[model samples]
Target: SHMCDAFVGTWKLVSSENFDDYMKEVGVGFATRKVAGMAKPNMIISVNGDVITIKSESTFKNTEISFILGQEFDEVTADDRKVKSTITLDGGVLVHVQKWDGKSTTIKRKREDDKLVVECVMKGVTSTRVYERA
Candidate 1:
Protein backbone atom coordinates (compact mmCIF):
# COMPACT_ATOMS: atom_id res chain seq x y z
CA SER A 1 0.00 0.00 0.00
CA HIS A 2 2.32 2.69 -1.31
CA MET A 3 -0.35 5.30 -1.05
CA CYS A 4 0.06 8.82 0.35
CA ASP A 5 0.85 8.19 3.98
CA ALA A 6 2.72 11.44 4.40
CA PHE A 7 -0.42 13.20 5.59
CA VAL A 8 -0.22 11.86 9.12
CA GLY A 9 0.44 14.38 11.86
CA THR A 10 -0.79 17.50 13.61
CA TRP A 11 -1.06 20.84 11.84
CA LYS A 12 -1.69 24.32 13.17
CA LEU A 13 -4.21 26.52 11.49
CA VAL A 14 -2.34 29.62 10.41
CA SER A 15 -5.23 31.45 8.87
CA SER A 16 -8.62 31.01 7.22
CA GLU A 17 -11.01 32.82 4.91
CA ASN A 18 -14.67 32.50 4.00
CA PHE A 19 -14.94 29.81 6.65
CA ASP A 20 -18.10 31.42 8.01
CA ASP A 21 -20.00 30.67 4.84
CA TYR A 22 -18.50 27.22 4.70
CA MET A 23 -19.84 26.49 8.15
CA LYS A 24 -23.24 27.88 7.23
CA GLU A 25 -23.46 25.40 4.39
CA VAL A 26 -22.69 22.62 6.85
CA GLY A 27 -25.68 23.70 8.94
CA VAL A 28 -23.52 24.73 11.82
CA GLY A 29 -25.14 27.06 14.37
CA PHE A 30 -24.22 30.72 14.26
CA ALA A 31 -22.28 30.71 17.52
CA THR A 32 -20.55 27.37 16.94
CA ARG A 33 -19.75 28.24 13.38
CA LYS A 34 -18.31 31.57 14.45
CA VAL A 35 -15.88 29.92 16.81
CA ALA A 36 -14.97 27.30 14.23
CA GLY A 37 -14.23 29.79 11.50
CA MET A 38 -12.31 32.28 13.58
CA ALA A 39 -10.53 30.08 16.04
CA LYS A 40 -7.38 28.29 15.00
CA PRO A 41 -8.10 24.64 14.24
CA ASN A 42 -5.57 21.94 14.90
CA MET A 43 -5.63 19.05 12.42
CA ILE A 44 -4.41 15.52 12.98
CA ILE A 45 -4.51 12.98 10.17
CA SER A 46 -3.50 9.33 10.20
CA VAL A 47 -3.50 7.27 7.04
CA ASN A 48 -2.73 3.59 6.71
CA GLY A 49 -3.50 2.19 3.27
CA ASP A 50 -7.20 2.86 2.68
CA VAL A 51 -8.21 3.50 6.25
CA ILE A 52 -7.77 7.16 7.17
CA THR A 53 -8.23 9.08 10.35
CA ILE A 54 -8.76 12.82 10.49
CA LYS A 55 -9.14 14.89 13.66
CA SER A 56 -9.89 18.58 13.60
CA GLU A 57 -9.31 20.38 16.87
CA SER A 58 -10.46 23.86 17.67
CA THR A 59 -11.68 25.92 20.56
CA PHE A 60 -15.21 24.97 19.65
CA LYS A 61 -14.84 21.23 19.16
CA ASN A 62 -12.65 18.36 18.09
CA THR A 63 -13.87 16.28 15.16
CA GLU A 64 -12.56 12.90 14.15
CA ILE A 65 -13.43 10.44 11.39
CA SER A 66 -12.05 7.01 10.52
CA PHE A 67 -12.77 5.59 7.10
CA ILE A 68 -11.39 3.13 4.56
CA LEU A 69 -10.92 4.11 0.97
CA GLY A 70 -13.53 2.96 -1.52
CA GLN A 71 -15.54 1.26 1.20
CA GLU A 72 -19.16 2.21 1.61
CA PHE A 73 -20.72 1.91 5.02
CA ASP A 74 -23.87 3.18 6.69
CA GLU A 75 -23.29 6.17 9.00
CA VAL A 76 -19.85 7.36 10.08
CA THR A 77 -19.71 8.78 13.56
CA ALA A 78 -17.24 11.67 13.64
CA ASP A 79 -16.41 15.06 15.23
CA ASP A 80 -17.12 13.74 18.70
CA ARG A 81 -20.64 13.53 17.24
CA LYS A 82 -22.54 11.31 14.84
CA VAL A 83 -22.63 11.77 11.10
CA LYS A 84 -23.22 9.42 8.19
CA SER A 85 -20.92 9.21 5.21
CA THR A 86 -19.17 6.92 2.77
CA ILE A 87 -15.61 7.99 1.99
CA THR A 88 -13.95 7.15 -1.30
CA LEU A 89 -11.23 8.42 -3.57
CA ASP A 90 -11.38 9.57 -7.15
CA GLY A 91 -7.79 9.55 -8.36
CA GLY A 92 -5.84 11.53 -5.76
CA VAL A 93 -8.88 13.44 -4.59
CA LEU A 94 -10.72 12.19 -1.50
CA VAL A 95 -14.49 12.32 -1.53
CA HIS A 96 -16.95 11.98 1.34
CA VAL A 97 -20.60 11.69 0.48
CA GLN A 98 -22.59 12.38 3.62
CA LYS A 99 -25.74 10.39 4.22
CA TRP A 100 -27.51 12.51 6.78
CA ASP A 101 -27.21 15.95 5.22
CA GLY A 102 -26.75 14.54 1.74
CA LYS A 103 -23.73 16.68 1.09
CA SER A 104 -20.78 15.46 -0.93
CA THR A 105 -17.47 16.90 0.27
CA THR A 106 -14.31 16.65 -1.77
CA ILE A 107 -10.85 17.03 -0.28
CA LYS A 108 -7.81 17.41 -2.49
CA ARG A 109 -4.22 17.05 -1.39
CA LYS A 110 -1.31 17.95 -3.59
CA ARG A 111 2.37 18.76 -3.20
CA GLU A 112 3.82 22.08 -4.25
CA ASP A 113 7.61 22.02 -4.17
CA ASP A 114 7.79 20.68 -0.61
CA LYS A 115 4.64 22.01 0.98
CA LEU A 116 1.27 20.30 0.84
CA VAL A 117 -1.91 21.94 -0.33
CA VAL A 118 -5.22 20.70 1.05
CA GLU A 119 -8.47 22.06 -0.21
CA CYS A 120 -12.01 21.23 0.90
CA VAL A 121 -15.13 21.98 -1.08
CA MET A 122 -18.77 21.14 -0.35
CA LYS A 123 -22.21 22.56 -1.05
CA GLY A 124 -20.84 25.34 -3.24
CA VAL A 125 -18.36 26.44 -0.58
CA THR A 126 -14.61 26.04 -0.86
CA SER A 127 -11.90 26.38 1.77
CA THR A 128 -8.27 25.92 0.82
CA ARG A 129 -5.61 25.30 3.41
CA VAL A 130 -1.89 24.70 3.06
CA TYR A 131 0.54 22.79 5.23
CA GLU A 132 4.29 22.45 5.45
CA ARG A 133 5.86 19.18 6.55
CA ALA A 134 6.78 19.24 10.19
Candidate 2:
Protein backbone atom coordinates (compact mmCIF):
# COMPACT_ATOMS: atom_id res chain seq x y z
CA SER A 1 0.00 0.00 0.00
CA HIS A 2 1.19 3.54 -0.64
CA MET A 3 0.76 4.36 3.00
CA CYS A 4 3.44 1.87 3.91
CA ASP A 5 5.75 3.22 1.26
CA ALA A 6 6.55 6.29 3.34
CA PHE A 7 8.61 4.21 5.78
CA VAL A 8 10.55 2.16 3.23
CA GLY A 9 14.15 3.16 3.71
CA THR A 10 17.22 2.88 5.92
CA TRP A 11 17.58 5.39 8.72
CA LYS A 12 20.45 6.10 11.08
CA LEU A 13 19.90 7.27 14.60
CA VAL A 14 21.00 10.85 15.01
CA SER A 15 19.96 11.77 18.52
CA SER A 16 18.15 10.20 21.41
CA GLU A 17 17.02 11.89 24.62
CA ASN A 18 15.52 10.49 27.82
CA PHE A 19 16.20 6.97 26.56
CA ASP A 20 17.73 5.94 29.88
CA ASP A 21 14.64 6.92 31.80
CA TYR A 22 12.42 5.12 29.35
CA MET A 23 14.52 1.98 29.57
CA LYS A 24 14.51 2.09 33.33
CA GLU A 25 10.79 2.60 33.48
CA VAL A 26 10.42 -0.43 31.21
CA GLY A 27 12.64 -2.57 33.48
CA VAL A 28 15.89 -2.73 31.59
CA GLY A 29 19.00 -3.48 33.61
CA PHE A 30 21.66 -0.90 34.21
CA ALA A 31 24.29 -2.95 32.39
CA THR A 32 22.13 -3.16 29.32
CA ARG A 33 21.26 0.51 29.43
CA LYS A 34 24.91 1.47 29.42
CA VAL A 35 25.52 -0.44 26.23
CA ALA A 36 22.30 0.69 24.64
CA GLY A 37 23.05 4.30 25.50
CA MET A 38 26.46 4.19 23.93
CA ALA A 39 25.31 2.46 20.78
CA LYS A 40 23.92 4.04 17.66
CA PRO A 41 20.94 2.19 16.25
CA ASN A 42 20.17 1.86 12.58
CA MET A 43 16.67 1.11 11.38
CA ILE A 44 15.62 -0.48 8.12
CA ILE A 45 11.95 -0.39 7.18
CA SER A 46 10.37 -2.40 4.39
CA VAL A 47 6.89 -3.14 3.14
CA ASN A 48 5.65 -6.19 1.26
CA GLY A 49 2.04 -6.30 0.22
CA ASP A 50 0.11 -6.17 3.51
CA VAL A 51 3.12 -6.78 5.73
CA ILE A 52 5.58 -4.37 7.23
CA THR A 53 9.04 -5.14 8.58
CA ILE A 54 11.17 -3.00 10.85
CA LYS A 55 14.73 -3.98 11.65
CA SER A 56 16.62 -2.21 14.43
CA GLU A 57 20.35 -2.84 14.49
CA SER A 58 22.87 -1.74 17.09
CA THR A 59 26.08 -2.92 18.67
CA PHE A 60 24.24 -4.13 21.75
CA LYS A 61 21.49 -6.09 20.03
CA ASN A 62 19.44 -6.29 16.88
CA THR A 63 15.69 -6.77 16.64
CA GLU A 64 13.31 -7.31 13.77
CA ILE A 65 9.54 -6.97 13.98
CA SER A 66 7.03 -7.86 11.28
CA PHE A 67 3.31 -7.21 11.36
CA ILE A 68 0.39 -6.12 9.27
CA LEU A 69 -1.12 -2.69 9.72
CA GLY A 70 -3.90 -2.71 12.32
CA GLN A 71 -3.14 -6.29 13.32
CA GLU A 72 -2.23 -7.33 16.84
CA PHE A 73 0.74 -9.66 17.36
CA ASP A 74 3.02 -10.89 20.09
CA GLU A 75 6.23 -8.97 20.27
CA VAL A 76 9.36 -9.58 22.32
CA THR A 77 10.84 -6.19 22.92
CA ALA A 78 14.53 -5.30 22.84
CA ASP A 79 14.63 -5.42 26.63
CA ASP A 80 13.27 -9.00 26.51
CA ARG A 81 9.78 -8.04 27.60
CA LYS A 82 6.93 -9.88 25.94
CA VAL A 83 3.97 -7.81 24.86
CA LYS A 84 0.99 -7.66 22.56
CA SER A 85 1.56 -4.98 19.97
CA THR A 86 -0.50 -3.32 17.28
CA ILE A 87 0.72 -0.92 14.61
CA THR A 88 -1.50 1.52 12.77
CA LEU A 89 -1.00 4.29 10.27
CA ASP A 90 -3.02 7.48 10.54
CA GLY A 91 -2.46 10.65 8.58
CA GLY A 92 1.09 9.67 7.64
CA VAL A 93 1.97 8.87 11.25
CA LEU A 94 2.79 5.38 12.43
CA VAL A 95 1.39 4.58 15.84
CA HIS A 96 2.59 1.52 17.72
CA VAL A 97 1.04 0.43 20.98
CA GLN A 98 2.41 -2.31 23.20
CA LYS A 99 0.63 -3.84 26.16
CA TRP A 100 2.60 -5.70 28.81
CA ASP A 101 2.24 -6.23 32.53
CA GLY A 102 -1.09 -4.53 32.36
CA LYS A 103 0.54 -1.34 31.12
CA SER A 104 0.46 0.36 27.78
CA THR A 105 3.37 1.92 25.94
CA THR A 106 2.86 4.03 22.87
CA ILE A 107 5.33 4.97 20.17
CA LYS A 108 4.62 7.41 17.38
CA ARG A 109 6.77 7.76 14.30
CA LYS A 110 6.46 10.53 11.75
CA ARG A 111 8.51 12.37 9.21
CA GLU A 112 9.65 15.92 9.88
CA ASP A 113 11.19 17.32 6.76
CA ASP A 114 14.11 14.97 6.00
CA LYS A 115 14.19 13.41 9.44
CA LEU A 116 12.23 10.66 11.11
CA VAL A 117 11.01 11.49 14.61
CA VAL A 118 10.04 8.73 17.02
CA GLU A 119 8.32 9.54 20.28
CA CYS A 120 7.98 6.83 22.93
CA VAL A 121 5.94 7.15 26.07
CA MET A 122 5.69 4.73 29.01
CA LYS A 123 4.89 5.25 32.66
CA GLY A 124 4.52 8.98 32.17
CA VAL A 125 7.99 9.27 30.74
CA THR A 126 8.59 10.25 27.16
CA SER A 127 11.67 9.60 25.09
CA THR A 128 12.32 11.17 21.72
CA ARG A 129 14.67 9.97 19.05
CA VAL A 130 15.54 11.47 15.72
CA TYR A 131 16.79 9.64 12.67
CA GLU A 132 18.04 10.67 9.27
CA ARG A 133 18.00 8.82 5.98
CA ALA A 134 21.00 6.65 5.58
Candidate 3:
Protein backbone atom coordinates (compact mmCIF):
# COMPACT_ATOMS: atom_id res chain seq x y z
CA SER A 1 0.00 0.00 0.00
CA HIS A 2 1.33 3.41 -0.95
CA MET A 3 -0.17 5.14 2.03
CA CYS A 4 0.91 6.52 5.37
CA ASP A 5 -0.85 3.57 6.97
CA ALA A 6 1.83 1.36 5.53
CA PHE A 7 4.36 3.29 7.60
CA VAL A 8 2.59 3.08 10.94
CA GLY A 9 5.00 1.17 13.14
CA THR A 10 7.98 1.31 15.47
CA TRP A 11 11.53 1.88 14.26
CA LYS A 12 14.95 2.46 15.74
CA LEU A 13 17.46 5.08 14.62
CA VAL A 14 20.67 3.18 14.35
CA SER A 15 23.34 5.55 13.03
CA SER A 16 23.63 8.84 11.30
CA GLU A 17 25.85 10.29 8.57
CA ASN A 18 26.84 13.97 8.46
CA PHE A 19 24.86 14.15 11.66
CA ASP A 20 27.20 16.64 13.27
CA ASP A 21 26.61 19.06 10.48
CA TYR A 22 22.93 18.44 10.67
CA MET A 23 22.87 19.06 14.41
CA LYS A 24 24.91 22.21 14.06
CA GLU A 25 22.36 23.55 11.67
CA VAL A 26 19.73 22.75 14.25
CA GLY A 27 21.73 24.77 16.77
CA VAL A 28 22.59 21.94 19.10
CA GLY A 29 25.33 22.73 21.61
CA PHE A 30 28.75 21.22 20.96
CA ALA A 31 29.05 19.18 24.15
CA THR A 32 25.58 17.67 24.07
CA ARG A 33 25.63 17.23 20.33
CA LYS A 34 28.74 15.11 20.39
CA VAL A 35 26.97 12.36 22.28
CA ALA A 36 23.62 13.04 20.64
CA GLY A 37 25.10 12.22 17.28
CA MET A 38 25.98 8.74 18.46
CA ALA A 39 22.91 8.27 20.63
CA LYS A 40 20.29 5.79 19.48
CA PRO A 41 16.65 6.81 19.06
CA ASN A 42 13.42 4.85 18.96
CA MET A 43 10.65 6.12 16.71
CA ILE A 44 6.96 5.33 16.67
CA ILE A 45 4.42 6.31 14.03
CA SER A 46 0.64 6.22 13.87
CA VAL A 47 -1.71 7.40 11.17
CA ASN A 48 -5.47 7.62 10.72
CA GLY A 49 -6.42 8.71 7.24
CA ASP A 50 -4.86 12.15 6.73
CA VAL A 51 -3.90 12.65 10.35
CA ILE A 52 -0.67 11.29 11.69
CA THR A 53 1.61 11.33 14.71
CA ILE A 54 5.28 10.52 15.21
CA LYS A 55 7.20 10.15 18.42
CA SER A 56 10.93 9.84 18.75
CA GLU A 57 11.79 8.05 21.98
CA SER A 58 15.26 8.30 23.38
CA THR A 59 16.97 7.32 26.59
CA PHE A 60 16.99 10.98 27.48
CA LYS A 61 13.61 12.21 26.25
CA ASN A 62 10.72 11.54 23.94
CA THR A 63 9.62 13.98 21.22
CA GLU A 64 6.13 13.70 19.85
CA ILE A 65 4.12 15.61 17.27
CA SER A 66 0.79 15.27 15.54
CA PHE A 67 -0.36 16.86 12.32
CA ILE A 68 -2.84 16.59 9.52
CA LEU A 69 -1.60 15.70 6.10
CA GLY A 70 -1.34 18.81 3.91
CA GLN A 71 -2.85 20.95 6.62
CA GLU A 72 -0.49 23.33 8.32
CA PHE A 73 -0.73 23.98 12.05
CA ASP A 74 1.28 25.21 14.94
CA GLU A 75 3.16 22.58 16.93
CA VAL A 76 3.64 23.69 20.48
CA THR A 77 5.97 21.81 22.84
CA ALA A 78 7.81 20.16 20.01
CA ASP A 79 11.08 18.87 21.37
CA ASP A 80 10.87 21.56 23.97
CA ARG A 81 10.37 24.09 21.21
CA LYS A 82 7.32 25.66 19.66
CA VAL A 83 6.79 25.11 15.95
CA LYS A 84 4.37 25.61 13.12
CA SER A 85 4.21 23.06 10.34
CA THR A 86 2.44 20.57 8.16
CA ILE A 87 2.85 16.96 7.13
CA THR A 88 1.88 15.47 3.81
CA LEU A 89 2.19 12.29 1.86
CA ASP A 90 4.52 12.69 -1.06
CA GLY A 91 4.02 9.50 -3.01
CA GLY A 92 4.92 6.68 -0.60
CA VAL A 93 6.98 9.06 1.48
CA LEU A 94 5.98 11.39 4.32
CA VAL A 95 7.10 15.00 3.98
CA HIS A 96 7.12 17.28 7.01
CA VAL A 97 7.76 21.03 7.23
CA GLN A 98 8.10 22.64 10.64
CA LYS A 99 8.65 26.30 11.46
CA TRP A 100 9.37 26.84 15.15
CA ASP A 101 11.26 27.19 18.43
CA GLY A 102 12.92 23.78 18.54
CA LYS A 103 13.75 23.17 14.86
CA SER A 104 11.90 23.84 11.69
CA THR A 105 12.32 22.37 8.24
CA THR A 106 11.22 19.73 5.78
CA ILE A 107 11.79 16.02 6.30
CA LYS A 108 11.11 13.02 4.16
CA ARG A 109 10.54 9.46 5.41
CA LYS A 110 10.20 6.13 3.67
CA ARG A 111 10.57 2.44 4.32
CA GLU A 112 13.49 0.68 2.68
CA ASP A 113 14.92 -2.80 3.10
CA ASP A 114 12.64 -3.52 6.05
CA LYS A 115 13.86 -0.35 7.72
CA LEU A 116 12.55 3.18 7.87
CA VAL A 117 14.71 5.89 6.40
CA VAL A 118 14.26 9.55 7.26
CA GLU A 119 15.85 12.30 5.16
CA CYS A 120 15.88 15.70 6.82
CA VAL A 121 16.76 19.22 5.74
CA MET A 122 16.33 22.39 7.73
CA LYS A 123 18.13 25.69 8.44
CA GLY A 124 20.93 24.79 6.02
CA VAL A 125 21.23 21.40 7.69
CA THR A 126 20.82 18.07 5.95
CA SER A 127 20.99 14.54 7.38
CA THR A 128 19.75 11.00 7.04
CA ARG A 129 18.41 8.77 9.86
CA VAL A 130 18.03 5.06 9.17
CA TYR A 131 15.66 3.09 11.37
CA GLU A 132 15.79 -0.65 11.92
CA ARG A 133 12.86 -2.82 12.88
CA ALA A 134 12.35 -3.23 16.60
Candidate 4:
Protein backbone atom coordinates (compact mmCIF):
# COMPACT_ATOMS: atom_id res chain seq x y z
CA SER A 1 0.00 0.00 0.00
CA HIS A 2 2.63 2.47 -1.04
CA MET A 3 1.18 5.78 -2.18
CA CYS A 4 4.36 6.58 -4.11
CA ASP A 5 3.15 4.47 -7.00
CA ALA A 6 0.09 6.67 -7.49
CA PHE A 7 2.05 9.49 -9.09
CA VAL A 8 4.54 8.60 -11.82
CA GLY A 9 5.70 10.05 -15.15
CA THR A 10 6.49 13.63 -16.02
CA TRP A 11 4.39 16.38 -14.50
CA LYS A 12 4.86 19.91 -15.78
CA LEU A 13 4.37 22.80 -13.39
CA VAL A 14 1.40 24.82 -14.62
CA SER A 15 0.99 27.16 -11.67
CA SER A 16 2.91 28.39 -8.62
CA GLU A 17 2.04 30.64 -5.67
CA ASN A 18 4.16 32.24 -2.92
CA PHE A 19 7.21 30.42 -4.13
CA ASP A 20 9.36 33.52 -3.71
CA ASP A 21 8.54 33.77 -0.04
CA TYR A 22 9.18 30.10 0.43
CA MET A 23 12.60 30.40 -1.17
CA LYS A 24 13.49 33.44 0.88
CA GLU A 25 12.68 31.69 4.11
CA VAL A 26 15.22 29.02 3.22
CA GLY A 27 17.92 31.68 2.71
CA VAL A 28 18.24 31.31 -1.03
CA GLY A 29 20.14 34.10 -2.75
CA PHE A 30 18.28 36.81 -4.62
CA ALA A 31 19.47 35.85 -8.09
CA THR A 32 18.80 32.18 -7.62
CA ARG A 33 15.45 32.94 -6.09
CA LYS A 34 14.40 35.15 -8.96
CA VAL A 35 15.61 32.72 -11.59
CA ALA A 36 14.14 29.77 -9.77
CA GLY A 37 10.83 31.47 -9.21
CA MET A 38 10.39 32.21 -12.87
CA ALA A 39 11.26 28.78 -14.13
CA LYS A 40 8.73 25.99 -14.43
CA PRO A 41 10.13 22.58 -13.66
CA ASN A 42 8.95 19.24 -14.90
CA MET A 43 8.87 16.69 -12.08
CA ILE A 44 9.53 13.09 -12.97
CA ILE A 45 9.04 10.18 -10.64
CA SER A 46 10.59 6.84 -11.38
CA VAL A 47 11.16 3.61 -9.54
CA ASN A 48 13.48 0.61 -9.55
CA GLY A 49 13.15 -2.01 -6.87
CA ASP A 50 12.83 -0.20 -3.55
CA VAL A 51 14.56 2.95 -4.74
CA ILE A 52 12.34 5.78 -5.88
CA THR A 53 13.77 8.61 -7.92
CA ILE A 54 12.31 12.07 -8.05
CA LYS A 55 13.64 14.62 -10.48
CA SER A 56 13.01 18.31 -10.93
CA GLU A 57 13.90 19.39 -14.44
CA SER A 58 14.31 23.14 -14.62
CA THR A 59 15.65 25.27 -17.41
CA PHE A 60 18.61 26.36 -15.36
CA LYS A 61 19.74 23.11 -13.82
CA ASN A 62 18.18 19.76 -13.17
CA THR A 63 18.28 18.02 -9.76
CA GLU A 64 17.09 14.76 -8.32
CA ILE A 65 17.17 12.47 -5.30
CA SER A 66 16.74 8.78 -4.98
CA PHE A 67 15.79 7.11 -1.72
CA ILE A 68 14.08 4.11 -0.34
CA LEU A 69 10.90 4.50 1.64
CA GLY A 70 11.56 5.51 5.27
CA GLN A 71 15.24 5.80 4.52
CA GLU A 72 17.46 8.74 5.31
CA PHE A 73 20.00 10.03 2.83
CA ASP A 74 22.25 12.96 2.14
CA GLU A 75 20.83 15.45 -0.32
CA VAL A 76 22.25 18.55 -1.90
CA THR A 77 19.40 20.99 -2.30
CA ALA A 78 18.84 23.24 -5.24
CA ASP A 79 20.01 26.13 -3.11
CA ASP A 80 23.25 24.19 -2.58
CA ARG A 81 22.55 23.29 1.02
CA LYS A 82 23.53 19.84 2.21
CA VAL A 83 20.55 18.27 3.94
CA LYS A 84 19.29 15.10 5.47
CA SER A 85 16.21 14.04 3.56
CA THR A 86 13.57 11.43 4.10
CA ILE A 87 10.52 10.44 2.11
CA THR A 88 7.32 8.76 3.08
CA LEU A 89 4.11 7.73 1.42
CA ASP A 90 0.97 8.81 3.19
CA GLY A 91 -2.19 7.58 1.62
CA GLY A 92 -2.03 9.06 -1.86
CA VAL A 93 0.32 11.82 -0.79
CA LEU A 94 4.09 11.68 -1.17
CA VAL A 95 5.76 13.49 1.72
CA HIS A 96 9.33 14.82 1.69
CA VAL A 97 11.15 16.43 4.60
CA GLN A 98 14.60 17.96 4.54
CA LYS A 99 16.78 19.30 7.30
CA TRP A 100 20.05 21.20 7.30
CA ASP A 101 21.98 23.86 9.19
CA GLY A 102 19.32 23.99 11.88
CA LYS A 103 16.68 24.61 9.20
CA SER A 104 14.02 22.30 7.89
CA THR A 105 11.26 22.23 5.26
CA THR A 106 8.58 20.01 3.85
CA ILE A 107 7.12 19.18 0.46
CA LYS A 108 3.95 17.21 -0.04
CA ARG A 109 2.92 15.94 -3.47
CA LYS A 110 -0.38 14.37 -4.25
CA ARG A 111 -2.62 13.50 -7.14
CA GLU A 112 -5.97 15.24 -7.27
CA ASP A 113 -8.22 14.25 -10.12
CA ASP A 114 -5.98 14.40 -13.19
CA LYS A 115 -3.62 16.96 -11.71
CA LEU A 116 -0.61 16.77 -9.42
CA VAL A 117 -0.52 19.22 -6.54
CA VAL A 118 2.71 20.06 -4.72
CA GLU A 119 2.86 21.98 -1.47
CA CYS A 120 6.11 23.64 -0.47
CA VAL A 121 6.41 25.03 3.04
CA MET A 122 9.08 26.86 5.04
CA LYS A 123 8.69 28.71 8.32
CA GLY A 124 5.66 30.98 7.86
CA VAL A 125 5.64 30.78 4.09
CA THR A 126 3.60 28.22 2.22
CA SER A 127 3.59 27.76 -1.53
CA THR A 128 1.42 25.71 -3.83
CA ARG A 129 2.48 24.41 -7.22
CA VAL A 130 0.09 22.60 -9.49
CA TYR A 131 1.16 20.34 -12.30
CA GLU A 132 -0.40 18.64 -15.25
CA ARG A 133 0.65 15.32 -16.70
CA ALA A 134 3.20 15.95 -19.43
In every candidate, how many clashes are there? 2, 0, 0, 0
Candidate 2 lDDT for residue 8: 85
| Candidate 1 local lDDT, 1-134, one digit each (tens) | 45555556777766566666666666667776655566666778788766788787767666677778767666533222245566666665556666455555655766556555666676689877776554
- Best to worst by lDDT, what's the order? 2, 4, 3, 1
The numbered model that scores best in TM-score is 2
* lDDT of candidates 1 onward, in order: 0.64, 0.91, 0.76, 0.89
Compared with the true structure, the alpha-carbon lDDT of candidate 4 equals: 0.89
Query: How many backbone clashes can be found in candidate 4?
Result: 0
Considering summed lDDT, which 10 consecutive residues are worst modelled in model 1? Answer: 75-84
TM-scores for all candidates?
Answer: 0.73, 0.95, 0.82, 0.94
Regions more than 4 Å wrong, model 4 = 1-3
Q: Pick the candidate with the highest lDDT.
A: 2
C-alpha lDDT (0 to 100) for residue 68 of candidate 1: 82
- lDDT (10s digit) by residue, model 3, range 36-98: 665688888887766688888886567788877778887653234467778877778888887
Native RMSD of candidate 2 (Å): 1.1
> How far is 13's C-alpha from truth in model 1 (Å)?
1.7
User: How many angstroms is residue 4 displaced in model 2 relative to the true structure, after the best TM-score fit?
Assistant: 2.1
- RMSD values for the candidates in order, in angstroms, are 3.0, 1.1, 2.7, 1.4
lDDT of 3 at 8: 83
Model 1, C-alpha of 21: deviation from truth (Å): 1.0
Candidate 2, residues 26-127, lDDT tens digits: the string is 888999888888888999999888889999998888999999989999998878889999999989999999998888899999998989999999879999
Candidate 2 similarity to native, TM-score: 0.95
